[PDB]
């Protein structure tokens, strides 16, 4: 706290308290007593614990039927209203579309949709497997993720 | 009909000394008493007991001989502050009191 270490006044003498600095951590414009530094927050969770968490999240979606399975789902033009109206007449609300392999048109068909994410096969995570209400799963990706989870 | 005077430069005791004797009187006597009291709060209160009768005859259409003072109260204004030079080092700032004087004259 920019100043200098000089006292305000000498210690004994005039009838006040024993002041110590112009950077005094109980003063106005003083310091902070336990100020914290630029830090990190990532913890570490195991390979076994992470895959056990994935096997735990892959069960209540079955017991509650928020996971549904579809073989083919795509479009043949980079246009987002086609997926919008496809989900409209398919009558779903909040979908996590996980493809099996690379797709460019359907990945170009989420950049204005809010309750839609065109997820890849591998890149799933056990908080976006609860944050989305309903979810599909393709048979190009079922074995691609079960070879991971073993 | 009421009248105010705010930031009148006197203190909230030496203005209340004049206006504890024109609370319950008639406004014929409550001008001659404020002439014939020798303070400065007599002037600071007679000017607004003048410019309340001269604003209840204009913006109310009331008379003069019908009136009677029913309530008069003072509030305490805010003060500027300047320093007085003490000796053997010290200094002292002094608070210079200002007043809000209010007159409330009614009819019946």
């Amino acid at each position: 706290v920019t100043g200098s270490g000089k006292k305000p006044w000498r210690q004994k003498g005039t009838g006040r308290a024993r002041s110590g600095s112009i950077k005094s951590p109980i003063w106005r414009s003083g310091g902070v007593t336990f100020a914290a530094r630029p830090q990190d927050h990532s913890q570490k969770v195991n390979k076994k614990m992470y895959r056990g968490a994935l096997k735990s999240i892959l069960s209540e979606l079955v017991r509650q039927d928020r996971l549904i399975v579809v073989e083919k789902f795509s479009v043949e033009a980079p246009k987002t209203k086609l997926l919008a109206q496809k989900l409209k007449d398919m009558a779903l609300e909040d979908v996590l579309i996980i493809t099996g392999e690379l797709d460019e048109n359907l990945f170009l068909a989420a950049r204005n949709l809010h309750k839609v994410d065109v997820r890849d096969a591998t890149g799933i995570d056990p908080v976006s497997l609860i944050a989305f209400d309903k979810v599909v799963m393709t048979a190009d990706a079922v074995k691609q993720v079960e070879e991971m989870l073993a | 009909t009421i009248a105010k005077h705010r930031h009148a430069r006197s203190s909230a005791q030496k203005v209340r000394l004049v206006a504890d004797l024109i609370r319950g009187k008639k406004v014929s006597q409550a001008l001659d008493i404020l002439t014939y009291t020798n303070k400065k709060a007599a002037v600071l209160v007679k000017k607004v007991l003048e410019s309340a009768i001269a604003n209840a005859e204009h913006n109310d259409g009331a008379d003069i001989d019908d009136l009677k003072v029913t309530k008069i109260f003072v509030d305490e204004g805010p003060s500027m502050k300047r320093i007085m030079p003490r000796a053997k080092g010290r200094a002292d700032r002094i608070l210079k009191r200002t007043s809000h004087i209010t007159v409330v004259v009614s009819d019946r």
Partner: peptide, 28 residues
Amino acid sequence: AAAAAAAAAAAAAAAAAAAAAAAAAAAA
């Protein structure tokens, strides 16, 4: 004319209460 009525309130950065030399108890 117009007003501007906030000027100064300084403690002048000067000294304080004094001391004593009126010797107290001391004997024997």
